[PDB]
A paper describes a structure:
Cellular entry is achieved by the homotrimeric S mediated virus-receptor engagement through the receptor binding domain (RBD) followed by virus-host membrane fusion. The S1 subunit binds the host cell receptor, while the S2 subunit mediates fusion of the viral membrane with the host cell membrane. Hinge-like movements of the RBD give rise to two distinct conformational states referred to as the “close” and “open”, where close corresponds to the receptor-inaccessible state and open corresponds to the receptor-accessible state, which is supposed to be metastable. We reported a potent therapeutic antibody H014, which can cross-neutralize SARS-CoV-2 and SARS-CoV infections by blocking attachment of the virus to the host cell.
Author numbering:
A (entry chain B): 726 to 827, 848 to 1064
B (entry chain A): 641 to 676, 689 to 725
C (entry chain A): 920 to 1147
The structure:
């Protein structure tokens, strides 16, 4: 399991610092481009948050669809292939995942800390991971090397053994024995996903970091920073413009700094992700679309194929 | 002339059913573009052409010819 | 070889136009330059901010005030400016880690792509990979990845195996194909059908196991020799 994109955030710095107040908002202009260079930082994040989801999931130029009649030789893919019944069209296993990953946002937009929507819907991501999977099944591994080429699936596993040094005469003789072992293996994933909350603990932390970083960024409004009171509207009602300058500029310089701390946290955290969205984009090319000769890159043991499955703000491979 | 998205209320762009490559991304799978007397349009992003790969258990497709393509990374 | 010469020499021909006619070609590198000139330019405009001081020109306050009061005013400029560098540096260290991550991916290719041949799919570019040509660029590097992409297709009926005497013949490398009459073995990624012989295939098991095996005759090179 890998994180891919992190929650796209955007801060309104004029509104967070001086809440809806004229006497204060004028003062924030002296500090100048601080406000305007944050949103240049939080935009550079939110742009590559689309680039990550772009590079990982869509490496394929066309969207393939699963052929209706399934003879794979006993391999039962119904689990990982899309289900038309659900209102959103997503494979059975993805649904087990979206249930794991999960006022609060009413007190975030009031201050400025908003959440932009991701470019690609959770629905569209499910159409890619249907194609990639539908290419891997039918077309072999060549659909990423060019136009897809259909191949009998049971003959594909005969190749993917010739990679790991098991001569293909082992497959066809064992095909039924492998069908049972494969179809049962996919059977165990369901329980390990559904019965264990720590399954997505990577992704659930990627979400619990932002909701932790934004929530803390709102509590920062409660700090005096040496000012006589933390409510911007008290000081203005309680003091003259001459003295409020001394008091307010202690709040601004404090709050405006509490964003530059938040942004600096994101840029770092968004580099942590941009490093994981490469490892996810590297697998997706070298693991799903190919066969990986790299030991323990695609998981313990000799590697045959991988099945991508979308997850909230992340991706889940079945190796 | 007010279109509704999943991202939010959009104003000033005619909705278009013709899904193209994403030009100006917006959010929740909507992309806007100036291509069309001209005006701004907005449409559901296209994922690329849909292609059914004909699959049958006895059949394989082996390429008879190739091309040498140079790509710049 | 000649057919590839034309296809290769023409491929390099197209790169020129795609480079010269499209400004977005280097858009990665041109942004790497446009970030610093954007970060430094902003770092100069920061000198125009009052930070709560009575005026933003350091030389005004000193001319306009005593040393006792200027301490109160100047230390508002310093603490502001000195902070506007710690913001700039923090931006660079992050941005220079973004690059140090890309200069590894460029150093990894240069070893595993140019100097070798990469078995890693879509690491060295879409399609099977042959070689890469590094080309310098300002504050960057530009690879020309020469890749092998199959083109024309033909539907072939195939079978995993062949019953000859009941021994199941499997291909050493390649698969069995049929144009509808004769069964041929051919290599996967290019169509070059050869006649099925005991030296194209190897023997394993029997015909009571394999699923999908088809009947045929497997030509034997030895039989016509001893028949001589
Ligand atoms: C693939 O496996 C699934 C479940 O492992 C099969 O679906 C089940 O089919 C039985 C009937 O034999 C029903 O009683 C169950 O309710 C079904 N379960 C689910 C989750 O749908 C499916 O038939 C198998 N397909 C193939 C081709 O073997
Ligand atoms: C290889 O191992 C598999 C299981 O790992 C064996 O298949 C099992 O055989 C026993 C009979 O002794 C059955 O009770 C199980 O149901 C089988 N499992 C499956 C998944 O089919 C198989 O027999 C072993 N083969 C050899 C040659 O030892
Ligand atoms: C393989 O494809 C190449 C082109 O992709 C073919 O070469 C072309 O052949 C036509 C004749 O029909 C000429 O007009 C072109 O000038 C050729 N192109 C080049 C670059 O030489 C080649 O004939 C094909 N080979 C097979 C066996 O189909
Ligand atoms: C399938 O390919 C085989 C081999 O090329 C064809 O058999 C040959 O056909 C040619 C005429 O097309 C004859 O001159 C040869 O004598 C045949 N070979 C033998 C060993 O008899 C066959 O005709 C092809 N069939 C189809 C449907 O394409
Ligand atoms: C390929 O030929 C073999 C014989 O060379 C066929 O084997 C026959 O199978 C049936 C069904 O079990 C038996 O009743 C016959 O006795 C077998 N023939 C012999 C000579 O033993 C085989 O069926 C053929 N392939 C297919 C797909 O039918
Ligand atoms: C899109 O097409 C449907 C039917 O194809 C039509 O009912 C609908 O009005 C179209 N959308 C717009 C914005 O015209
Ligand atoms: C192979 O058969 C399928 C069956 O529908 C067809 O769509 C495809 O075009 C055929 N291949 C070629 C090269 O025409
Ligand atoms: C291929 O599928 C057909 C049904 O379309 C079936 O009759 C045949 O036995 C299958 N062959 C193999 C080898 O799976």
């Amino acid at each position: 399991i890998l994180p891919v994109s992190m929650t796209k955030t955007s801060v309104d710095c004029t509104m967070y610092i001086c809440g809806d107040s004229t006497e204060c908002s004028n003062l924030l202009l002296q500090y100048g481009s601080f406000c305007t260079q944050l949103n240049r930082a939080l935009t550079g994040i939110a742009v590559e948050q689309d680039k990550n989801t772009q590079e990982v999931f869509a490496q394929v130029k066309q969207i393939y669809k699963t052929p209706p009649i399934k003879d794979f030789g006993g391999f039962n893919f119904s689990q990982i292939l899309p289900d038309p019944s659900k209102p959103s069209k997503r494979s059975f296993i993805e649904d087990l995942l979206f249930n794991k990953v999960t006022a609060m946002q009413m007190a975030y937009r009031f201050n400025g800390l908003t959440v932009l929507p991701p470019l690609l819907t959770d629905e569209m991501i499910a159409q890619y991971t249907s194609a990639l999977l539908a290419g891997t099944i039918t077309s072999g591994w060549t659909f990423g090397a060019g136009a897809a080429l259909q191949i009998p699936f049971a003959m594909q596993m005969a190749y993917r053994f010739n990679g790991i040094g098991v001569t293909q005469n082992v497959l066809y003789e064992n095909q039924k024995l492998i069908a049972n072992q494969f179809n049962s293996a996919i059977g165990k994933i369901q329980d390990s996903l559904s019965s264990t909350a720590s399954a997505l603990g990577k992704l659930q932390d990627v979400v619990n970091q932002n909701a932790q970083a934004l929530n803390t960024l709102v509590k920062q409004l409660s700090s005096n920073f040496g000012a006589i009171s933390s409510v911007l509207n008290d000081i203005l009602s309680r003091l003259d413009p001459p003295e409020a300058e001394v008091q307010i500029d202690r709040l601004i310089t404090g709050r405006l700094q509490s964003l530059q701390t938040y942004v600096t946290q994101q840029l770092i955290r968004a580099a942590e992700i941009r490093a994981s969205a490469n490892l996810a984009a590297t697998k997706m090319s070298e693991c799903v679309l190919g066969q990986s000769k790299r030991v323990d890159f695609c998981g313990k043991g000799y590697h045959l194929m991988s099945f991508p499955q979308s997850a909230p703000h992340g991706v889940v491979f079945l190796h | 002339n007010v279109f509704q998205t999943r991202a939010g209320c959009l104003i000033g762009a005619e909705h278009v059913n013709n899904s193209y490559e994403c030009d100006i991304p917006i959010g929740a799978g909507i992309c806007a573009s100036y291509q069309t007397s001209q005006s701004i349009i907005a449409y559901t992003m296209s994922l690329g052409a849909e292609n059914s790969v004909a699959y049958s258990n006895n059949s394989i497709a082996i390429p008879t010819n190739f091309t040498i393509s140079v790509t710049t990374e | 070889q000649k057919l590839i010469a034309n296809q290769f020499n023409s491929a390099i021909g197209k790169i020129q136009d795609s480079l010269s006619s499209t400004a977005s070609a280097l858009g990665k590198l041109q942004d790497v330059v446009n970030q610093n000139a954007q970060a430094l330019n902003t770092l100069v405009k920061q000198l125009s901010s009052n930070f709560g001081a009575i005026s933003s020109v350091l030389n005004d306050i000193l001319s306009r005030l005593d040393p006792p009061e200027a301490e109160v005013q100047i230390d508002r400029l310093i603490t502001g400016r000195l902070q506007s560098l710690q913001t700039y540096v923090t931006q660079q260290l992050i941005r220079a880690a973004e690059i140090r991550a890309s200069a590894n991916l460029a150093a990894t290719k240069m070893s595993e792509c140019v100097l070798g041949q990469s078995k890693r799919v879509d690491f060295c570019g879409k399609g099977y990979h042959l070689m890469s040509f590094p080309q310098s660029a300002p504050h960057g590097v530009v690879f020309l990845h020469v890749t092998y992409v199959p083109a024309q297709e033909k539907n072939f009926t195939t079978a995993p195996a062949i019953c000859h005497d009941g021994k199941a013949h499997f291909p050493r490398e390649g698969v069995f194909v049929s144009n509808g009459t004769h069964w041929f073995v051919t290599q996967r990624n290019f169509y070059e059908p050869q006649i099925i012989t005991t030296d194209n295939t190897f023997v394993s098991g029997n015909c009571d196991v394999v699923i999908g095996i088809v009947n045929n005759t497997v030509y034997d090179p030895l039989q016509p020799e001893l028949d001589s």
